[PDB]
Amino acid sequence: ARSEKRVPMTRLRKRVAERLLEAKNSTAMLTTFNEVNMKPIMDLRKQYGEAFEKRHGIRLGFMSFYVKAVVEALKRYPEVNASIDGDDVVYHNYFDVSMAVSTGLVTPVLRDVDTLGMADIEKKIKELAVKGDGKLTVEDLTGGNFTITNGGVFGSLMSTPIINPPQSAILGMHAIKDRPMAVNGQVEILPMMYLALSYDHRLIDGRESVGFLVTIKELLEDPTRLLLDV
Amino acid sequence: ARSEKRVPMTRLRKRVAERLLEAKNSTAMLTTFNEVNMKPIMDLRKQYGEAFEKRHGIRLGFMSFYVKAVVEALKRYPEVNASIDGDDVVYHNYFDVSMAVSTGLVTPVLRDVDTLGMADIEKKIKELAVKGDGKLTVEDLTGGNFTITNGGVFGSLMSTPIINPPQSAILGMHAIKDRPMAVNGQVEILPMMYLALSYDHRLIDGRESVGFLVTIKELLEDPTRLLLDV
Amino acid sequence: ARSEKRVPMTRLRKRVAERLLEAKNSTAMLTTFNEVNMKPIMDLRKQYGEAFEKRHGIRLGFMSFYVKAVVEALKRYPEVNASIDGDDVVYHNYFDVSMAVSTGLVTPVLRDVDTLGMADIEKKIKELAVKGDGKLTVEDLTGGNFTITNGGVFGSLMSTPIINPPQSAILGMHAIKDRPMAVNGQVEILPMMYLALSYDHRLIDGRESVGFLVTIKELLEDPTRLLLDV
Amino acid sequence: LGMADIEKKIKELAVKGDGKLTVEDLTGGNFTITNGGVFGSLMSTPIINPPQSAILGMHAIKDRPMAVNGQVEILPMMYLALSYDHRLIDGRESVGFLVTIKELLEDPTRLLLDV
């Protein structure tokens, strides 16, 4: 009933807090943005949804497309898939991608997503999403070379994600909103989504950060490009 | 007439500078953005402007709407209305909102805005705006749980506000510009304004920061929601 | 063939890294954004391109327009053209503008651009761009009061540039994209580009940062304003 | 001088025309610009002011049909007369001198680009 209520910082919250503070003071974090047209993917889902479910027992969603795109990007830009280890740059020759799941929020790791099929990525993601029960073992919460954080779920237009050290970058998805867009001289309404790539400028430079995000944009706007490799 | 002019840093400027530098190194500041359609409010003002003035002797402006919206948001998200006191989280059971007034810029405090009527908020805001004469006593400049900073006045499209410790977040208004928008399958021009909520990620998390801003968006786009509480 | 590859941080990369990290911890960097309509300039270039080339032997591009606009802005806001020297504010009475050229990226300096003609600025910029051969002497890489960094070249929509100490601000250009825009009640497609001005809030305040960017916007949207001084 | 400045100085002299015009003001000058549109002057022949070599005469701005990219449109047109001492200034120059004026007046931006 008094004007101020002091509640002791729980050890967990206290640990997290220090982490976040050191995450921002240890790195030279910067953020680059871009936008993507979710029309193509949304159509793929409308056309092959049922088929995909019957044939794989798992629903086709956005995530597998994002993860597939991220891996191809990580493949073209190993710098973004590397970490800084004191006086070293540790290039990882594998592809583990951390994926934020609500619970606070937690970062379970999808391992070797470069070898997984979409149905598979769709299943694993569900596993972790489901384990968020509270049965998330730290053997699940460790590692990861890159992180993808969703936020559209809340109605997030655009924002600045915080890096997750020792990782070098983080990709933040946002809400898909209809937005007027110029398309071949004509203005048309498309389901647009902003992408935010925050990165450690100590390791990753402009050209790369930009190109990394463009690549994601390209492969998401026409998944077929994954196949042709253009 | 020489190539360089060295002017000694005035003690005031020097104090401020150190503050700003420690404000950014002490916290894990992040920024989340969104946009609002100022059409509704602008209409309320056109329709009831005169009436409001005659009946209250004060002009109806944007501020009272922003402050009312902020308080309701602060009410739904006490975390954003709390501070971090060393090893504590101090939840404030009252509603003081700092409001940046030009002069440098100064942060006078509106106290217990949760009990004020719009006419009242309109008057108090004027008082402080007027005292910016230079009769601003520190009994006015202290406290505040949250801060609202206007910048549209200069033509600011969008930007990143800096937190004002010990406060946990800050809401930055910007210029209202006509922008094509998709409205029920049709593109229409609306008076849009971007909102930037910068916050201390040590205390406030994504879900909250996002939801906090969405709520503001919702209540500003239809003030009636304040009444129905939806 | 192993999962991790450790490559020693080269001394150069190591020096840079420390710099970037201290650039972000020493200052209270903030970023303000805006957008510009590149239609006007693009037309000037289409109309007078040939003429300009024949008469000056150098092609007319965007850069000279940006630099001319920046100088006029720097002239109206000396604070942005000043540095912080320990306990001092060093106002520079000259106009050197650092310009990022790819090679990593390097910041050659254009000296006294306030006295240069567009043809001249076009030539000098080419010199440095060409010396990027790798014949860039540090007598070229030193100094600079402000920095302009291009990124549209990569497809950069919008981003946050990092300040280059001892400098106080940095202007980041981005990709020019057609975007629907409201123009006198009618929606029309214009070649729009976002501008990001990051600045040291220890020295430069909102009003100034905003106004500095608006001015750039104004002079770029109608170069004639440089002549009339309005 | 900046335009604002030229605008002020011109006013000074226009105002001193009080009758406080000192010959220290009335001497010199390399070229002369004479306005006449003020009276409704369509076009005319200005007289040179020796020792000067030429003189530019402005005239009334009148709407006149004009061909503009295959289409006839009404524009606020004004004739320019450049009278000059042919002993020193030749055709090519007199013509080019006037064209240049025409160009820079039709698009002031050209002053900036220098084209």
Curated annotation (Swiss-Prot), chains A, B, C:
Function: E2 component of the 2-oxoglutarate dehydrogenase (OGDH) complex which catalyzes the second step in the conversion of 2-oxoglutarate to succinyl-CoA and CO(2).
Cofactor(s) the record lists: (R)-lipoate
Name of this protein: Dihydrolipoyllysine-residue succinyltransferase component of 2-oxoglutarate dehydrogenase complex
Pathway note: Amino-acid degradation; L-lysine degradation via saccharopine pathway; glutaryl-CoA from L-lysine: step 6/6
Quaternary organization: Forms a 24-polypeptide structural core with octahedral symmetry. Part of the 2-oxoglutarate dehydrogenase (OGDH) complex composed of E1 (2-oxoglutarate dehydrogenase), E2 (dihydrolipoamide succinyltransferase) and E3 (dihydrolipoamide dehydrogenase); the complex contains multiple copies of the three enzymatic components (E1, E2 and E3). Interacts with SucA (via N-terminus), the E1 component of OGDH complex.
Keywords, comma-separated and alphabetical: Acetylation, Acyltransferase, Lipoyl, Transferase, Tricarboxylic acid cycle
GO process terms (BP): L-lysine catabolic process to acetyl-CoA via saccharopine; tricarboxylic acid cycle
Molecular function GO terms recorded: dihydrolipoyllysine-residue succinyltransferase activity
Cofactor binding note: Binds 1 lipoyl cofactor covalently.
Residues of the full protein shown: 173 to 405 of 405
GO cellular component: cytosol; oxoglutarate dehydrogenase complex
EC number(s) given by UniProt: 2.3.1.61
Keyword Transport: no
Highest classification ranks of the organism: Bacteria, Pseudomonadati, Pseudomonadota, Gammaproteobacteria, Enterobacterales
